[PDB]
Design an enzyme around this catalytic site. Structure first.
Site, PDB file in Angstrom:
ATOM      1  N   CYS A  69      43.703  63.396  68.927  1.00  0.00           N
ATOM      2  CA  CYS A  69      44.136  64.512  68.163  1.00  0.00           C
ATOM      3  C   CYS A  69      44.747  64.013  66.766  1.00  0.00           C
ATOM      4  O   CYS A  69      46.020  63.547  66.749  1.00  0.00           O
ATOM      5  CB  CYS A  69      44.945  65.615  68.764  1.00  0.00           C
ATOM      6  SG  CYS A  69      45.526  67.001  68.177  1.00  0.00           S
ATOM      7  N   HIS A 109      35.682  64.849  73.812  1.00  0.00           N
ATOM      8  CA  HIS A 109      34.311  65.363  74.141  1.00  0.00           C
ATOM      9  C   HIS A 109      33.501  64.711  72.858  1.00  0.00           C
ATOM     10  O   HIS A 109      34.120  63.977  72.162  1.00  0.00           O
ATOM     11  CB  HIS A 109      34.314  67.101  73.781  1.00  0.00           C
ATOM     12  CG  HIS A 109      34.702  67.231  72.323  1.00  0.00           C
ATOM     13  ND1 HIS A 109      33.817  67.184  71.258  1.00  0.00           N
ATOM     14  CD2 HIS A 109      35.852  68.031  72.038  1.00  0.00           C
ATOM     15  CE1 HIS A 109      34.880  67.646  70.275  1.00  0.00           C
ATOM     16  NE2 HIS A 109      35.803  68.108  70.738  1.00  0.00           N
ATOM     17  N   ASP A 110      32.191  64.776  73.166  1.00  0.00           N
ATOM     18  CA  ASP A 110      31.202  64.098  72.256  1.00  0.00           C
ATOM     19  C   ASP A 110      31.194  64.516  71.068  1.00  0.00           C
ATOM     20  O   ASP A 110      31.838  65.804  70.840  1.00  0.00           O
ATOM     21  CB  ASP A 110      29.847  63.931  72.939  1.00  0.00           C
ATOM     22  CG  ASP A 110      29.631  62.977  74.286  1.00  0.00           C
ATOM     23  OD1 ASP A 110      30.854  62.105  74.497  1.00  0.00           O
ATOM     24  OD2 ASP A 110      29.178  63.515  75.191  1.00  0.00           O
ATOM     25  N   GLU A 137      38.383  73.685  67.478  1.00  0.00           N
ATOM     26  CA  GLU A 137      38.826  72.506  66.711  1.00  0.00           C
ATOM     27  C   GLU A 137      38.447  72.879  65.204  1.00  0.00           C
ATOM     28  O   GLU A 137      39.251  72.779  64.127  1.00  0.00           O
ATOM     29  CB  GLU A 137      38.543  71.038  67.090  1.00  0.00           C
ATOM     30  CG  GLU A 137      39.600  70.892  68.234  1.00  0.00           C
ATOM     31  CD  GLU A 137      38.750  69.858  69.229  1.00  0.00           C
ATOM     32  OE1 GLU A 137      37.667  69.330  68.995  1.00  0.00           O
ATOM     33  OE2 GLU A 137      39.420  69.659  70.500  1.00  0.00           O
TER      34      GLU A 137
HETATM   35  C1  HEM Z   1      48.848  70.794  72.640  1.00  0.00           C
HETATM   36  C2  HEM Z   1      47.944  71.032  71.515  1.00  0.00           C
HETATM   37  C3  HEM Z   1      46.835  70.114  71.655  1.00  0.00           C
HETATM   38  C4  HEM Z   1      46.286  69.448  72.404  1.00  0.00           C
HETATM   39  C5  HEM Z   1      46.531  68.971  73.784  1.00  0.00           C
HETATM   40  C6  HEM Z   1      45.050  68.670  71.442  1.00  0.00           C
HETATM   41  C7  HEM Z   1      44.224  67.905  72.110  1.00  0.00           C
HETATM   42  C8  HEM Z   1      43.116  67.388  71.449  1.00  0.00           C
HETATM   43  C9  HEM Z   1      42.078  66.496  72.100  1.00  0.00           C
HETATM   44  C10 HEM Z   1      42.158  66.127  73.424  1.00  0.00           C
HETATM   45  C11 HEM Z   1      41.134  66.278  71.172  1.00  0.00           C
HETATM   46  C12 HEM Z   1      39.904  65.440  71.179  1.00  0.00           C
HETATM   47  C13 HEM Z   1      38.801  66.165  70.917  1.00  0.00           C
HETATM   48  C14 HEM Z   1      37.534  65.453  70.488  1.00  0.00           C
HETATM   49  O1  HEM Z   1      37.445  65.328  69.115  1.00  0.00           O
HETATM   50  O2  HEM Z   1      36.852  64.923  71.238  1.00  0.00           O
HETATM   51  C15 HEM Z   1      41.476  67.062  69.840  1.00  0.00           C
HETATM   52  C16 HEM Z   1      41.004  66.926  68.715  1.00  0.00           C
HETATM   53  C17 HEM Z   1      41.072  67.759  67.397  1.00  0.00           C
HETATM   54  N1  HEM Z   1      42.387  68.441  67.375  1.00  0.00           N
HETATM   55 FE1  HEM Z   1      43.944  68.650  68.712  1.00  0.00          FE
HETATM   56  N2  HEM Z   1      44.936  69.408  70.240  1.00  0.00           N
HETATM   57  C18 HEM Z   1      46.194  70.480  70.250  1.00  0.00           C
HETATM   58  C19 HEM Z   1      46.325  71.035  68.958  1.00  0.00           C
HETATM   59  C20 HEM Z   1      45.622  71.000  67.697  1.00  0.00           C
HETATM   60  C21 HEM Z   1      46.072  71.924  66.928  1.00  0.00           C
HETATM   61  C22 HEM Z   1      47.300  72.882  66.778  1.00  0.00           C
HETATM   62  C23 HEM Z   1      45.289  71.209  65.585  1.00  0.00           C
HETATM   63  C24 HEM Z   1      45.069  71.930  64.354  1.00  0.00           C
HETATM   64  C25 HEM Z   1      45.890  73.162  63.924  1.00  0.00           C
HETATM   65  C26 HEM Z   1      44.511  70.380  66.112  1.00  0.00           C
HETATM   66  C27 HEM Z   1      43.305  69.814  65.391  1.00  0.00           C
HETATM   67  C28 HEM Z   1      42.518  69.086  66.046  1.00  0.00           C
HETATM   68  C29 HEM Z   1      41.445  68.796  65.306  1.00  0.00           C
HETATM   69  C30 HEM Z   1      40.831  69.262  63.924  1.00  0.00           C
HETATM   70  C31 HEM Z   1      40.481  67.918  66.497  1.00  0.00           C
HETATM   71  C32 HEM Z   1      38.915  67.412  66.301  1.00  0.00           C
HETATM   72  C33 HEM Z   1      39.087  65.816  65.644  1.00  0.00           C
HETATM   73  C34 HEM Z   1      37.661  65.308  65.606  1.00  0.00           C
HETATM   74  O3  HEM Z   1      36.629  65.940  65.957  1.00  0.00           O
HETATM   75  O4  HEM Z   1      37.420  64.235  64.987  1.00  0.00           O
HETATM   76  N3  HEM Z   1      44.807  70.080  67.557  1.00  0.00           N
HETATM   77  N4  HEM Z   1      42.936  67.985  70.324  1.00  0.00           N
HETATM   78 MN   LIG Z   2      35.568  62.833  71.016  1.00  0.00          MN
END
Ligand code: HEM
Ligand SMILES: [Mn+2]
Ligand SMILES: *[C@@H]1O[C@H](CO)[C@@H](O[C@@H]2O[C@H](CO)[C@@H](O[C@@H]3O[C@H](CO)[C@@H](O)[C@H](O)[C@@H]3O)[C@H](O)[C@H]2NC(C)=O)[C@H](O)[C@H]1NC(C)=O
Ligand SMILES: *[C@@H]1O[C@H](CO)[C@@H](O[C@@H]2O[C@H](CO)[C@@H](O)[C@H](O)[C@H]2NC(C)=O)[C@H](O)[C@H]1NC(C)=O
Ligand SMILES: *[C@H]1O[C@H](CO)[C@@H](O)[C@H](O)[C@@H]1O[C@H]1O[C@H](CO)[C@@H](O)[C@H](O)[C@@H]1O
Ligand SMILES: *[C@@H]1O[C@H](CO)[C@@H](O)[C@H](O)[C@H]1NC(C)=O
Ligand SMILES: *[C@H]1O[C@H](CO)[C@@H](O)[C@H](O)[C@@H]1O
Ligand SMILES: *[C@H]1O[C@H](CO)[C@@H](O)[C@H](O)[C@@H]1O
Ligand SMILES: *[C@H]1O[C@H](CO)[C@@H](O)[C@H](O)[C@@H]1O
Ligand SMILES: *[C@H]1O[C@H](CO)[C@@H](O)[C@H](O)[C@@H]1O
Ligand SMILES: *[C@H]1O[C@H](CO)[C@@H](O)[C@H](O)[C@@H]1O
Ligand SMILES: *[C@H]1O[C@H](CO)[C@@H](O)[C@H](O)[C@@H]1O
Ligand SMILES: *[C@H]1O[C@H](CO)[C@@H](O)[C@H](O)[C@@H]1O
Ligand SMILES: *[C@H]1O[C@H](CO)[C@@H](O)[C@H](O)[C@@H]1O
Ligand SMILES: *[C@H]1O[C@H](CO)[C@@H](O)[C@H](O)[C@@H]1O
Ligand SMILES: [Br-]
Ligand SMILES: [Br-]
Ligand SMILES: [Br-]
Length: 299
Positions: free
Chosen positions: A30, A106-107, A184
């Site tokens: 993330c 995830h993929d 996301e």
């Molecule tokens: C406890 C809070 C959070 C947890 C546990 C978490 C967890 C994760 C995980 C496991 C992924 C990987 C998903 C993937 O792309 O395969 C991810 C991706 C991502 N997260 Fe976090 N997330 C949290 C909060 C946030 C917040 C608040 C934001 C922005 C406001 C954010 C932005 C993103 C973005 C943009 C991705 C996609 C990255 C990509 O596709 O390359 N996340 N998150």
């Molecule tokens: Mn992934």
């Protein structure tokens, strides 16, 4: 940034400097958690993290309200129990375990390779966790030559990623994840849409340079005029954006899309894993940090 720098003022009045993760530090798949950890808003070692620590870090340092991360907290802790094999209470063991594949991770990510992307053998796996510049470039290429993009552009981005991943992943691995991904997508609009435009709340446009800075550097694009959204973004904005991306008309259709790729997505819901199910091994790579250039404390 350094507390005295006033770089976050008056939006964040209590900043801490960027510090690169070291080889023993835990980082996530993330870009948000990684930026928070790099600043020490959550532990710089990426270990032993409570729900309140996460809530406060997001709210105070990124302008993301508690409602936005409610499901994300639930799912982090579900995955923690699944990977470690015991309930971890209110101390998330580390960030790295969040890259457990076909779970929360995830993929077809915007900026990470898939767990079995391009592998010659079925048992092989690769780093699905660290920022991958090439993968991210496949996302950015969809909006090449632009400074901003809208919901329909984001829809095209995620379709391109789904198509590339479905083509490149070891046969049988690829699993579409529209509900998690497009939360996301909404997170991206929430954090780095251009709040300087008069209709941002109704019609948000992502500032591409802000997006690229955040993802590439895993730090906050203050030098480009970004600041935490004020008031803090709420879940309603995020899921509305998620829905809007998926509702947006597709004008360019990639080949090799999984079934039903185009159209509405289900609501993201809590994850659950069978007790008999053994977790996939986590990629063991050292945490990514920006090195061209390396970042200073105020970057
Ligand atoms: C406890 C809070 C959070 C947890 C546990 C978490 C967890 C994760 C995980 C496991 C992924 C990987 C998903 C993937 O792309 O395969 C991810 C991706 C991502 N997260 Fe976090 N997330 C949290 C909060 C946030 C917040 C608040 C934001 C922005 C406001 C954010 C932005 C993103 C973005 C943009 C991705 C996609 C990255 C990509 O596709 O390359 N996340 N998150
Ligand atoms: Mn992934
Ligand atoms: C973040 O936490 C996770 C979960 O605890 C860590 O992944 C796990 O790391 C341990 C090693 O400390 C692995 O245990 C080893 O497993 C092998 C094969 O089952 C066994 O032969 C060894 O004796 C040992 O028990 C465990 O496999 C691994 N879990 C998974 C699902 O991959 C991870 O290393 C932590 N990361 C950081 C950077 O702190
Ligand atoms: C990652 O952060 C670095 C450091 O803030 C960025 O480098 C700066 O880029 C700006 C352009 O806005 C230049 O004016 C500065 O001279 C750069 N500083 C250094 C030390 O090179 C870098 O552009 C960021 N990466 C991305 C992709 O946004
Ligand atoms: C992670 O570490 C494992 C052993 O601890 C290896 O078996 C894996 O292949 C994986 O290696 C990759 O990441 C480590 C980071 O510790 C590097 O040292 C390796 O060169 C490799 O990139
Ligand atoms: C930062 O401090 C200034 C000056 O006291 C104040 O006006 C502002 O509300 C503070 N910002 C936040 C987010 O608390
Ligand atoms: C983002 O949120 C919307 C609304 O819940 C979903 O339809 C979509 O699949 C994604 O999870
Ligand atoms: C996004 O979607 C959720 C349901 O998934 C709504 O509760 C919210 O108001 C927004 O439309
Ligand atoms: C839900 O909210 C989003 C973001 O404010 C809008 O863009 C969308 O049209 C819907 O009203
Ligand atoms: C989810 O919500 C979005 C934004 O309100 C709509 O565009 C879509 O049709 C779905 O209801
Ligand atoms: C939605 O509307 C667009 C308009 O650009 C068409 O290209 C598409 O086929 C879909 O009907
Ligand atoms: C339809 O419009 C999309 C963006 O909305 C483009 O990416 C595509 O090439 C076509 O012009
Ligand atoms: C329109 O855009 C899509 C998604 O970016 C491409 O897959 C297609 O080839 C066309 O350029
Ligand atoms: C590309 O092609 C698909 C399927 O034919 C359409 O659903 C999309 O709108 C675009 O024209
Ligand atoms: C990142 O680290 C390198 C170390 O050589 C510096 O050159 C750079 O200014 C930044 O601090
Ligand atoms: Br650990
Ligand atoms: Br590949
Ligand atoms: Br779906």
């Amino acid at each position: 940034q350094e507390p005295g720098s006033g770089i976050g003022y008056p939006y964040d009045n209590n900043t801490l400097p960027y510090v690169a993760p070291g080889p023993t530090d835990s980082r996530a798949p993330c870009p948000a958690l990684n930026a928070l950890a790099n600043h020490g808003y959550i532990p710089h070692d990426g270990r032993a993290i409570s729900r309140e620590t996460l809530q406060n870090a997001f709210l105070n340092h990124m302008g993301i309200a508690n409602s936005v991360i409610e499901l994300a907290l639930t799912n982090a802790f579900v995955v923690c129990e699944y990977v470690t094999g015991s309930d971890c209470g209110d101390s998330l063991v580390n960030l790295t375990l969040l890259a457990e594949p076909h779970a929360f991770e995830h993929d077809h990510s915007f900026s990470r390779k898939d767990y079995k992307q391009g592998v010659a053998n079925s048992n092989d796996f690769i780093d699905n966790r660290n920022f991958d510049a090439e993968t991210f470039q496949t996302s950015l290429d969809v909006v090449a030559g632009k400074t901003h993009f809208d919901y329909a552009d984001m829809n095209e981005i995620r379709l391109q990623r789904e198509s590339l991943s479905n083509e490149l992943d070891f046969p049988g691995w690829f699993t579409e994840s529209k509900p998690i991904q497009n939360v996301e997508s909404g997170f991206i609009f929430a954090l780095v849409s251009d709040f300087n435009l008069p209709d941002n709340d109704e019609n948000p446009l992502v500032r591409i340079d802000w997006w690229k800075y955040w993802f590439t550097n895993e730090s906050f694009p203050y030098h480009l005029g970004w600041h935490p959204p004020s008031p803090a973004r709420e879940i309603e904005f995020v899921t509305s954006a998620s829905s809007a991306v998926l509702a947006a008309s597709v004008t360019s259709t990639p080949s090799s899309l999984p079934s039903g790729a185009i159209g509405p997505g289900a609501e993201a819901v809590p994850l659950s894993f069978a007790s008999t199910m053994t977790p996939f091994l986590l990629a063991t790579n050292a945490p990514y940090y920006a090195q061209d250039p390396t970042l200073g404390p105020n970057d």
